[PDB]
Amino acid sequence: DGANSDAAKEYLTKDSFSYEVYGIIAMQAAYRDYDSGDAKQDDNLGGMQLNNESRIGFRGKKQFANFEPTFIWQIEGGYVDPSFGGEGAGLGERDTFVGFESASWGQVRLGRVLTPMYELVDWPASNPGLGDVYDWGGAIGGAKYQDRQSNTIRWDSPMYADKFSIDAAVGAGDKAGLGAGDDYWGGIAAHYKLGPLQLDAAYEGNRNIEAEGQTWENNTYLVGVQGWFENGISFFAQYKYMEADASNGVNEKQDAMSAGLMYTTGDWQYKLGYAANFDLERDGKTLSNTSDDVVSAQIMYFVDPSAVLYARARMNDFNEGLDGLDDAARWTSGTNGDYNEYSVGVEYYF
Amino acid sequence: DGANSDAAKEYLTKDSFSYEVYGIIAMQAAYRDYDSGDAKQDDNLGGMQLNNESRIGFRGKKQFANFEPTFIWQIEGGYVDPSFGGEGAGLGERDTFVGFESASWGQVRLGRVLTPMYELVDWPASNPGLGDVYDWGGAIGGAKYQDRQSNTIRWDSPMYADKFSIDAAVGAGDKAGLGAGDDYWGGIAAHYKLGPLQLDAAYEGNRNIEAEGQTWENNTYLVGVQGWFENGISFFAQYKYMEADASNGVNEKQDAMSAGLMYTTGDWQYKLGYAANFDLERDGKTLSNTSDDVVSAQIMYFVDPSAVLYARARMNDFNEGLDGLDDAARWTSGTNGDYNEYSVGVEYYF
Amino acid sequence: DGANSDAAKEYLTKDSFSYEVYGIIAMQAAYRDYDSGDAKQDDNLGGMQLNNESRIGFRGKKQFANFEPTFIWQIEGGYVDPSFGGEGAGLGERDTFVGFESASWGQVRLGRVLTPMYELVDWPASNPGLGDVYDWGGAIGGAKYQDRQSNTIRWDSPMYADKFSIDAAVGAGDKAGLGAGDDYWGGIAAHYKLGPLQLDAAYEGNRNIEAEGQTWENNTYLVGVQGWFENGISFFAQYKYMEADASNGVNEKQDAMSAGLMYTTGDWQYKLGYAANFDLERDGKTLSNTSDDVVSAQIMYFVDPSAVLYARARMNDFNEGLDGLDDAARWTSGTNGDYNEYSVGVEYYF
Numbered sequence A, B, C: 001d002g003a004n005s006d007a008a009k010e011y012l013t014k015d016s017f018s019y020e021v022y023g024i025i026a027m028q029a030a031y032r033d034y035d036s037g038d039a040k041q042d043d044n045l046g047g048m049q050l051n052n053e054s055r056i057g058f059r060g061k062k063q064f065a066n067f068e069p070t071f072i073w074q075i076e077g078g079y080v081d082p083s084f085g086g087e088g089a090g091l092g093e094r095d096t097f098v099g100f101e102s103a104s105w106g107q108v109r110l111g112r113v114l115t116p117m118y119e120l121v122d123w124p125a126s127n128p129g130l131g132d133v134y135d136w137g138g139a140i141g142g143a144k145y146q147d148r149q150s151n152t153i154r155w156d157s158p159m160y161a162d163k164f165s166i167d168a169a170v171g172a173g174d175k176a177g178l179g180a181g182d183d184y185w186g187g188i189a190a191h192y193k194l195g196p197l198q199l200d201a202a203y204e205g206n207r208n209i210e211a212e213g214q215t216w217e218n219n220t221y222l223v224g225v226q227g228w229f230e231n232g233i234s235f236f237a238q239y240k241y242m243e244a245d246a247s248n249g250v251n252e253k254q255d256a257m258s259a260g261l262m263y264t265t266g267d268w269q270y271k272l273g274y275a276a277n278f279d280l281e282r283d284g285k286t287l288s289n290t291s292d293d294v295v296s297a298q299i300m301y302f303v304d305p306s307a308v309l310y311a312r313a314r315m316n317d318f319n320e321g322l323d324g325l326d327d328a329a330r331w332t333s334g335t336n337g338d339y340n341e342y343s344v345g346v347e348y349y350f
């Protein structure tokens, strides 16, 4: 069984107690109110649900006797009981990898991690609740980018000159990872600290992506600013340019932004979010009402050095529909309709 | 990813070493002898199997700095290799929840737990091996009650006056948990200790259940006694009334009982149990041969304060079949036929 | 739920801290180049992939107060993110069992383990990368033997006279474990160490195996030698004879060999491996082009007492096709075509 059987137990010396067990406990009671234009469908999707995103993980580091880079590894399970889905999570569904890190050249990781692009798209630009629009939202064909991805080599640089830092990565695609395609992708991201600000830029290219009966080339570019100030204010703003190119000559473009404001004061943190996709342009013809936007408010309370309570409201107004290149409806995050969500939740880290 | 991604790891202080790892090791070597009236089907279902119900779990408590109630959480994986099923269980398949508790008002839990009704159906009734008949057995339409269920808020009262105790909960149904329905349920249970006896009462109502082309209403009532005596005798008895009501006017009723006698002597414990479903009445007319009954015997031996060995035999006589309100056979615990079972097993708690 | 509900938590004394957490970290970057005579399939199946075979497990032992044999238990999860498959593994997918052990007669284990034959087929044969041909390779009908299998009772003898050793087991088949068949199997294996050499023999018989419209009986025999010398040289050689017999009278026979050479020198270990399946004989007529071959080379580096690095190249030349007794293509490990593979990897034991 496996590349080297269980011969690891028979020949190597067990490095006893060289692990940390960790977990994030996270529950969110969330009520959803849909306006899909169908009353029956509105009642199924909408309602109260308990979105339990708790998870257990294991991680550790080892200094190999005869290797300069330090070995690192991680196995993090998925959400134990998310909303809209069944119970029980596997080990290895979130960030799971081995890797090396030397003070001389930064960090390398092989396995299942976030692409340099998505890492910025996810945080800060997706919080709180902007993900339906800015994360996996959109109308562009092909693969706008990957999120958390397996079969990935990712290199994380150290803080160069105490201001600059780099992340770059390449990997196989979703279909390639199952032996049923040859899609691949690559991407890189940059960060520069200019005082209390931080500037960000990132790129990602996806290739040989089969969808809607075509092969796709996807290119996505991103710029953003982030600020933290001592009076308590933090902000973030981001602009995102999405370009898709199909094998039948069809070109596609769509852009999007995300911005968030927050005031931390003592034991409280107030926060407003807004993100939006602009109209999608296919073959140089703007498609009417292909945009999405979402507004969001949240009050958080630092109940413990290790935990927080929070309430949150948000309203998603999605596009009115899109047609695919195969002459059938193309799924978007708004296929299920506009909806509002009100929720309270807890998060705790041990 | 998620309501707050990995922002808990980057910003919150890791409460290091504040978790418990626990497990129940449980193996059951079980031979089954089926009498379904088909020699082939008898041979597939019947035979020797290893029912491995072992499980690993994680749990903990934390006193939040600025909150009086103590935080609680649990994540329990399911059976690692049960009979009739493939190997491997996810993390979070069993009781998995967050909650708070103060000794003045008991505990509240959010997540996936046992409903107050089913908990009594589970223990003391249903043991040993009475479950096929009393637990998920029956012929009534809709949902007589839920088992272990997600999207549940449940409050467990403290022991008032050291004699009275209460459990209550409400939650989402199976289809709602996937955004495909609007079913819900609620229930309550009461306990009173009168010396060596204990009285039990419980209710559960199920609403908006889609099945066999109808919407269903379910109502279930339960009463029971339990006795522990120093001489060594222990017993339990229970009566259960189930009322279902369909959207096309059809009414349905069925009742059941469960009783068990037990003799503990030193390191040994003998136990004989009986459970039965009585004929189902649809539209106030008894349906012939819709009953089920089971007899069961078991010898247990306390090999360690932390483990037990046990032998057990049981014979199940199931109902012979009934059609649902859609004119198709309604699945029951006897769809696979009658069967007797002989088994040995171990249980261990770390 | 289950054979005894959650009554183990309610009555038994938690044997706190009698659990060990263990894991094997294993990542392999593997490039594949397929030449199946189909270009689209060559590129889907072929390419670079990251085969993460890491795994977490738990094991422990307990001395029961009122039992002389020591109780042992194990729950080992599966590969967290293997190549050609999705992410996330269950708890209990690798070796998972309960058992007892006394120094007088060895150990007995109930659950999920390797059959005495496969353990030898697995290690030392099949390494490095000979498994496609020697492990699950072959063209014989029915089931030559089981891999890691559930519903198994297995006995491992002590080291008799410091030279002799025996392993034997019996269990249920793949279909029987799901209530859909009555297949079973049994097998035994013996080892004798003569100085720097070691002699190996094993047998396994499988019965009531349903496939290709017939029921099958399988008989598989194996002999092998292993050598370790102070010079640094080690080798292994194995011959395998497989006999299958169908319910329509059709007989089939096929044999195979596996061989490996290794030179350990300081912190490096070189290794050449070869394994092959010979032409398949059905009804005493050798079938043309049913043989399989694989050559493999490997460089290993003991990077730490607890880990190794390795590079590996290997060439797989498979059979040209075979028809089953149902007059349809019979799946073999070469159905997807020939492929060569170049790979690097790390393995770590904590």
Ligand SMILES: CN[C@@H]1[C@@H](O)[C@@H](O[C@@H]2[C@@H](O)[C@H](O[C@H]3O[C@H](CN)CC[C@H]3N)[C@@H](N)C[C@H]2N)OC[C@]1(C)O
Residues within 6 Å of the ligand: A136, A331
């Ligand atoms: C990251 N969260 C994901 C989110 O990315 C998204 O994923 C969609 C997925 O739902 C779509 O699939 C959905 O719509 C299909 C329309 N023909 C039918 C099947 C349905 N599950 C996929 N076609 C594309 C993914 N990006 O919706 C599911 C989710 C779990 O919330």
Ligand SMILES: CCCCCCCCOCCOCCOCCOCCO
Residues within 6 Å of the ligand: A237, A257, A259, A276, A277, A278, A288, A289, A290, A291, A292, A293, A317, A318, A319, A320
């Ligand atoms: C630093 C602050 C920057 C704020 C930038 C805000 C950009 C706002 O532009 C939004 C344009 O998109 C409008 C979306 O229209 C709604 C679409 O929904 C209806 C279906 O078409």
Ligand SMILES: CCCCCCCCOCCOCCOCCOCCO
Residues within 6 Å of the ligand: C199, C200, C223, C224, C225, C237, C238, C239, C253, C254, C255, C257, C258, C278, C281
């Ligand atoms: C314990 C000693 C180990 C010996 C292993 C020897 C490995 C090399 O032996 C190769 C023998 O190959 C035989 C080829 O058989 C031809 C096919 O005949 C079978 C007809 O069904």
Ligand code: NA
Residues within 6 Å of the ligand: A043, A044, A045, A046, A047, A048, B176, B179, B180, B181, B182
């Ligand atoms: Na709903």
Ligand code: NA
Residues within 6 Å of the ligand: A099, A107, A108, A109, A154, A155, A156
């Ligand atoms: Na990295």
Ligand code: NA
Residues within 6 Å of the ligand: A146, A147, A148, A149, A174
């Ligand atoms: Na992806």
Ligand code: NA
Residues within 6 Å of the ligand: A172, A176, A177, A179, A180, A181, A182, C043, C044, C045, C046, C047, C048, C049
């Ligand atoms: Na590939």
Ligand code: NA
Residues within 6 Å of the ligand: B043, B044, B045, B046, B047, B048, C176, C179, C180, C181, C182, C183
């Ligand atoms: Na069987």
Ligand code: NA
Residues within 6 Å of the ligand: B146, B147, B148, B149, B174
């Ligand atoms: Na349920």
Ligand code: NA
Residues within 6 Å of the ligand: A150, A151, A177, A178, C050, C081, C082, C083, C084, C085, C086
């Ligand atoms: Na993969």
Ligand code: NA
Residues within 6 Å of the ligand: C146, C147, C148, C149, C174
């Ligand atoms: Na098997």
